[PDB]
Amino acid sequence: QQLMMILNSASDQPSENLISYFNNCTVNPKESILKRVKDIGYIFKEKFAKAVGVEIGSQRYKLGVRLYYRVMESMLKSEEERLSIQNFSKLLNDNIFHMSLLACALEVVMATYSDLSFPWILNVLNLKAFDFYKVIESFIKAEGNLTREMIKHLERCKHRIMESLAWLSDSPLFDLIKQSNHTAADMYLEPVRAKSTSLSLFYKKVYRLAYLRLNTLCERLLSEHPELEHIIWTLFQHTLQNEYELMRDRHLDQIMMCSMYGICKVKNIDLKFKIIVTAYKDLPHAVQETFKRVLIKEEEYDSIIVFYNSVFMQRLKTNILQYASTRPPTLAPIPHI
């Protein structure tokens, strides 16, 4: 609420201190920013009215712009001490950065006055999910006045990217994988020419997420053999690392479910899919469609079992059978607290 009243009384264009920073740039970007704001405003108002039968669409967008500008300033204030004069100015003239900061401010506004739910704004601004991921944490950390529910929303936005949206085809994440600290500005200053801080942070966070979800379902379902959780994590984590094609257009929680059934299957452990798959519904934001509609190949979808036997097993039979031999694979590290 407080932030929402700083914005209503605030201004639709940059503070003077924010312009101080524009005056610290070699290529004064301010011209480019104002143009970006207006051209985006045009596309935003269209797609806005296009879905809800302007007046509201214009006012949503201006609050975002006030939030966009407030956070940029705060963000630039940390980045003074971190970036060279050259990197500072490259940031302020970087399209994908500014697109992502504004898209994140706008999502805040949209979801406060809340389907139009995320990722609508990323389809509005044609902004790749993986690009947007780079801004979220630094955004939360640059706006001390986000409410709890709202932080929860950005984090939910963040987690859906980690679990699916970054794994969509044509998503740049796959281009970054093939070639194989951590502020939003660091990740946007990455070039598009051939190690990626962006990929390293994403995979690191994904592993902590993916494991914590594994841990929950393993304690409920594998308390009879607490020995299986670390083995299942090994299959899961090996799969995310070296068989990353399996995640393409699929869901992190789908790979988690196959791994637990797979490991229990080669351990001759009686734990059927539906026994765990019913337990997955009891995860916080879980959906039934996650195990009811699973991609096989060329746009053909089916249950998770059809995915298990017809795609998952076909691709991992060589790895999975090592876990029951006299020379099982070495166990993968647990992601750090």
Numbering used by the authors: 383 to 435, 439 to 499, 511 to 576, 599 to 612, 643 to 785
List passages from the publication reporting this PDB structure.
The retinoblastoma tumor suppressor (Rb) is a multifunctional protein that primarily regulates the cell cycle but also has roles in cellular differentiation, DNA damage response, and apoptosis. Essential functions of Rb occur through its pocket domain, which is necessary for regulating binding interactions with E2F transcription factors and transcription repressors that bind via an LxCxE motif. The pocket domain is the most highly conserved region of the multidomain protein, as well as the most frequent site of mutations. Protein X-ray crystallography of four missense variants reveals how mutations destabilize the protein fold and inhibit E2FTD or LxCxE binding.
For E554K and E533K, we sought to understand the structural basis for large reductions in RbP-E2F1TD binding as well as substantial decreases in thermostability. The significance of E554 in Rb-E2FTD binding was initially pointed out by the authors of the two RbP-E2FTD structures as forming an H-bond the phenolic hydroxyl of conserved tyrosine in E2F1TD and E2F2TD. The structure of the cancer-associated variant, E554K, reveals how the lysine substitution disrupts the potential for these interactions by forming a shared salt bridge with E533 and E551. Remarkably, the crystal structure of E533K shows something similar in which the mutated lysine sidechain creates a salt bridge triad with E554 and E551 in a manner that occludes the Y411(E2F1TD)-binding pocket. Together, the variant structures of E533K and E554K reveal a structural basis for the disruption of E2FTD binding. However, from these structures alone, it is not clear how the mutations induce fold destabilization. In the structures of RbP-E2F2TD RbP-E2F1TD, both E554 and E533 form A/B subdomain-spanning salt bridges to K653. It is possible that the loss of the salt bridge interactions contributes to the large destabilization effects observed for these variants. Within the cyclin fold of subdomain A, the greatest destabilizing effects (ΔTm) are caused by E554K (−7.0 ± 0.5 °C), E533K (−6.4 ± 0.5 °C), E492Q (−5.4 ± 0.8 °C), A490V (−5.1 ± 0.6 °C), K462E (−5.0 ± 0.5 °C), E539D (−4.9 ± 0.5 °C), A490T (−4.7 ± 1.0 °C), and A488V (−4.1 ± 0.6 °C).
